[PDB]
Design a binder for this molecule. Structure first.
Ligand code: FES
Ligand SMILES: [K+]
Ligand SMILES: [Mg+2]
Ligand SMILES: [Mg+2]
Ligand SMILES: [Mg+2]
Ligand SMILES: [Mg+2]
Ligand SMILES: [Zn+2]
Lengths: 43, 43, 161, 162, 40, 38, 75, 99, 177, 100, 38
């Protein structure tokens, strides 16, 4: 039981992917670098 | 009541004999961790 | 008899770990000098046997002792029999004491010498690539120059102050 | 507190109530501004199901909870203690607060299973016969969500579902 | 391990970067003469 | 008992009780009002 | 975005490159701002001279020092 | 082809082995692996995992000293974090600056 | 150490016997501890092919405690192989049938899924109560600390501890508690 | 009284810094086992007219019983005890290299 | 593929899922719960 129809990560019905805590922290870490890039490009 | 030597073994007799060898090595200065032989040119 | 931040004792009132009280820096500075003096006297009086050292050489670290062999994975431009000093010593250890660099020990403190005893090449190393159904196949053989070093002596000087 | 004694003398029943000794709150609470017993002693978020010394003050002699109007607890804390007491009973930490049994009732022996952090009543829960896929796994709840805000001394947060 | 900490001390995140551990000569002649500079 | 996703009291004598992990509507006056959470 | 990375000399990752802080350069940097880290070059001892050209080191703080002794600070 | 690709795994597996061995030695002294490695770096001790694993096996007294040093540096970190800056830097927390 | 070569090797690779008390302990934490010891992962000389695992003796496995409602919810599934042979039992049912099965299954699932696993299980000695055979009792070396601290029941608190905890509220004198 | 680690099992660790602060000195003498913490070694283990002779009690066991005995004695599975074929026996290196 | 407007809630690209997770509303949390103060 518990089959995903067709291929897992494409199509209409897909296997749900969830966002882990460290995935969030990774994204926020790069958001901080880009925010600082904005600043040093302002002068 | 002071530990001169200690030896491992698979039997008490074997362990006791090994401990005697360890004590002899310490008494005679042939310990595994003794100062290595000096091969440097004589001064 | 209750301070403003007093909490009754519960399973979560305080942290699980025990409280640690570190020594007074002034009192510990005096204790440190005593320890250093004691170890220094052991060096002066020669109260050590075989020494070992951790040396950084050719990008990597080697735990060594007198009479050891180490296989350097490159050529060194030295004739066989030439004696050299290993200048990057991270650690020197004895039965009863150990000295640690931050990250490297001073050259006055420890001297590690070694001798080139062989200059050769490694056995043949096959490099082959293959991708199925793509007529993609290639083979290369490489032999890497090597140098064998013998550690002759590890000596320490009473320069701990 | 107030007791009640029923005495039948000469085919006559007399119902009377007497005032017994009453315990008093300890003096000088560390946070007099607090609006309930919990925050008056800076205990908010700092107690658990096994803190029977705390929990036992808010329960009846037979293990029942006391009304919130009497204790003075706030709804938030009153609900936390309510769940904590249920878990304390189920863990066997309140052996002197058992239910009242009528005369002539000796409970039949029942299998002893040591348990703790038991959210639900054992009899009301069904087996997890079908666990489900990893992305839709049926989980076994542990502890209570009411205590999610308790002080966490570890870097990992409390896992409430196993 | 420790990359962020090293950066906070003004050091290279990787200890293989700049500093005495990498740049100083690996060896010298026993007599005292310095070795030819390393290729890296 | 009729299975219901939404439990509703149908008279003043209906009372909501949670038993065996689910909510029930019980009514002594009109037993037909009895409902089980689905 | 691939082509601007080449134009800025950033083909190899984690390899610092120095660029002029001017509108034209900034215009390119903005296209690829999500791919790079921008920090100001700091010159605590001024610009390198001909005498000290060979003794410079770019630290992780962004300061380009003109003396690199590889020795501990006596202070 | 297997022989060629195995050169990557050999390096990977060796480091995994060192971490397992270092983890075991650290637990004997009540320290978790991340606590030992992290705090040794903060003491400017750059011993790599290969040497650390060798020390655990053949130099157990030196390893306990390293474990003690890491434990000491770890406690100094806690004291600093709990303080508001009033306290001076820990004796083992001072960093040797190079230029 | 200055030992002879053969005694030196014998000592380093010797098998230690550990004792673990399962009373009021969750089987998973017991299993995590036993698994490390049975594999040899607690030794700096560890290597997969060094067959360096130790003996683990777990007593009082009848008195393990699950958190939550795992007694009712956790199901153990097996299949005899015959049509209709699928069997599912709750942890409670299995425990009363076999007072060592739960701990044994928890350990078995944590060990590496290779041919060494069944050899490691031969070094595991599970006992439901506090009775341990004399031979096994004689070879024990060290008892491992229990992973879970057992909470005290209200009747186990000393009057000093009870007196130290403050009274938090004043009940009304006219309330029938 | 502060000690980073307990000093009662392996060695007495004392950590110190040099005055310059560039070297960490670690003094770690060994701790000897106390005499009180030891046990005594168990040295302690008729008009027979006829010389007592050695009696062979090594009755041969069949493969199954023998393997069960060995597996129980060494706490192993039966598999290790069964023989292997000629192909594997002749592949084993009988003069393997020896480091020390 | 599926059109931009669907009857079901279309699965998002993983990067977009992460974006949503990182930009969720965080309410202002007071130092002391207002119910615990006069
Ligand atoms: S009013 Fe403070 S916790 Fe209830
Ligand atoms: K699909
Ligand atoms: Mg498919
Ligand atoms: Mg790697
Ligand atoms: Mg198509
Ligand atoms: Mg489309
Ligand atoms: Zn009704």
């Amino acid at each position: 039981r518990g089959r995903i129809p067709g291929r897992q990560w494409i199509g209409k019905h897909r296997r749900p992917r969830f966002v882990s805590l460290r995935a969030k922290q990774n994204m926020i870490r790069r958001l901080e670098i880009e925010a600082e890039n904005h600043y040093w490009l302002s002068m | 009541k002071k530990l001169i030597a200690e030896g491992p073994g698979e039997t008490v007799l074997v362990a006791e004999e090994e401990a005697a060898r360890v004590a002899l090595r310490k008494l005679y200065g042939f310990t595994e961790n003794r100062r290595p032989w000096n091969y440097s040119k004589p001064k | 008899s209750y301070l403003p931040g007093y909490v009754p004792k519960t399973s979560l009132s305080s942290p699980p770990w025990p409280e640690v009280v570190l020594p007074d820096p002034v009192e510990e500075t005096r204790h440190h000098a005593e320890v250093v003096k004691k170890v220094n006297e052991m060096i002066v009086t020669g109260q050590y046997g075989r020494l070992f050292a951790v040396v950084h050489f050719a990008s990597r670290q080697w735990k060594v002792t007198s009479e050891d062999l180490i296989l350097i994975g490159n050529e060194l431009d030295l004739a066989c029999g030439e004696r050299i000093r290993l200048e990057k010593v991270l650690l020197v250890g004895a039965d009863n004491f150990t000295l640690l660099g931050k990250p490297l020990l001073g050259k006055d403190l420890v001297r590690v010498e070694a001798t080139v005893i062989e200059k050769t090449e490694s056995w043949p190393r096959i490099i082959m690539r293959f991708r199925k159904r793509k007529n993609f196949k290639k083979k290369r053989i490489v032999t890497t120059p090597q140098t064998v070093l013998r550690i002759n002596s590890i000596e320490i000087a009473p320069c701990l102050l | 507190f107030r007791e009640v004694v029923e005495t039948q003398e000469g085919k006559t029943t007399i119902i009377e109530g007497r005032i017994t000794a009453t315990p008093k709150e300890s003096p000088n609470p560390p946070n007099p501004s607090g609006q309930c017993p919990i925050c008056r002693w800076n205990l908010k978020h700092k107690y658990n199901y096994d803190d029977v010394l705390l929990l036992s003050q808010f329960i009846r002699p037979h293990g029942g909870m006391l009304p919130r109007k009497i204790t003075g607890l706030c709804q938030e804390e009153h609900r936390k203690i309510e769940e904590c007491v249920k878990m304390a009973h189920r863990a066997g930490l309140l052996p002197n607060h058992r239910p009242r049994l009528p005369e002539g009732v000796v409970p039949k022996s029942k299998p002893q299973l040591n348990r703790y952090l038991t959210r639900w009543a054992p009899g009301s829960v069904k087996p997890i016969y079908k666990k489900g896929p990893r992305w839709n796994r049926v989980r076994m709840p542990v502890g209570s969500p009411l205590l999610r805000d308790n002080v966490c001394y570890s870097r990992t947060p409390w896992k409430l579902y196993h | 391990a420790g990359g962020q900490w090293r950066l906070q001390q003004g050091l290279a995140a990787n200890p293989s970067g700049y500093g005495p551990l990498t740049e100083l000569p690996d060896w010298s002649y026993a007599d005292g003469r310095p070795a030819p500079p390393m290729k890296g | 008992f009729k299975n219901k996703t939404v439990l509703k009291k149908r008279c003043k004598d209906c009372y909501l009780v949670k038993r065996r992990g689910r909510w029930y509507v019980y009514c002594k006056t009109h037993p037909r009002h009895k409902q089980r959470q689905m | 975005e691939k082509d601007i990375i080449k134009m800025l000399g950033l083909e190899k990752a984690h390899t610092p490159q120095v660029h002029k802080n001017i509108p034209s350069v900034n215009a390119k940097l903005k296209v690829v701002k999500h791919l790079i880290r921008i920090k100001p070059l700091k010159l605590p001892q001024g610009l390198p001279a001909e005498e000290n050209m060979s003794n410079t080191c770019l630290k992780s703080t962004g300061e380009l020092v003109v003396q690199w002794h590889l020795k501990p600070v006596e202070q | 082809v297997k022989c060629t690709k195995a050169r990557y795994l050999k390096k990977k597996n060796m480091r995994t082995l060192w971490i397992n061995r270092i983890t075991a030695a650290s637990q004997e002294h009540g320290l978790k692996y991340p606590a030992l490695i992290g705090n040794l770096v903060k003491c400017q001790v750059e011993l790599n995992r290969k040497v650390l694993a060798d020390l655990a096996i053949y130099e157990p007294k030196t390893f306990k000293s390293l474990a003690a040093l890491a434990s000491r540096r770890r406690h100094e970190g806690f004291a600093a974090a709990l303080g508001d800056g009033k306290e001076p830097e820990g004796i083992f927390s001072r960093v040797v600056q190079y230029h | 150490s200055s030992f002879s070569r053969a005694p030196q090797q014998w000592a380093t690779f010797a098998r230690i016997w550990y004792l673990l008390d399962g009373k009021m302990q969750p089987p998973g934490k017991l299993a995590a501890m036993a698994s490390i010891r049975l594999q040899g992962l607690h030794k700096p000389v560890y290597h997969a092919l060094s067959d360096c695992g130790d003996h683990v003796v777990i007593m009082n496995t009848r008195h393990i405690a699950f958190s939550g409602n795992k007694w009712e919810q956790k199901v153990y599934s097996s299949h005899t192989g015959y049509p209709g042979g699928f069997r599912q039992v709750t942890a409670a049912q299995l425990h009363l049938r076999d007072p060592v099965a739960i701990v044994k299954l928890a350990i078995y699932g944590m060990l590496p899924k290779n041919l060494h696993r069944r050899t490691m299980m031969e070094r595991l000695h599970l006992f439901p109560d506090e009775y341990i055979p004399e031979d096994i009792l004689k070879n024990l070396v060290e008892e491992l600390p229990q992973p879970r601290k057992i909470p005290k029941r209200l009747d186990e608190y000393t009057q000093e501890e009870i007196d130290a905890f403050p009274r938090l509220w004043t009940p009304p004198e006219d309330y029938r508690l | 009284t502060y000690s980073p680690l307990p000093d009662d099992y392996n060695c007495n660790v004392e950590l110190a810094l040099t005055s310059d602060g560039r070297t960490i000195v670690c003094y770690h003498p060994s701790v000897d086992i106390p005499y009180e913490h030891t046990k005594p070694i168990p040295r302690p283990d008729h008009d027979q007219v006829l010389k007592t002779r050695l009696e062979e009690k090594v009755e041969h066991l069949e493969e199954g019983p023998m393997i069960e005995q060995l597996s129980k004695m060494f706490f192993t599975t039966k598999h290790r005890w069964y023989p292997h074929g000629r192909y594997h026996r002749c592949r084993k290196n009988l003069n393997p290299p020896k480091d020390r | 593929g599926s059109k931009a407007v669907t009857r079901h809630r279309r699965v998002m690209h993983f990067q977009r899922q992460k974006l949503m997770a990182v930009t969720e509303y965080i309410p202002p949390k007071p130092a002391i719960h207002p119910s615990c103060l006069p």
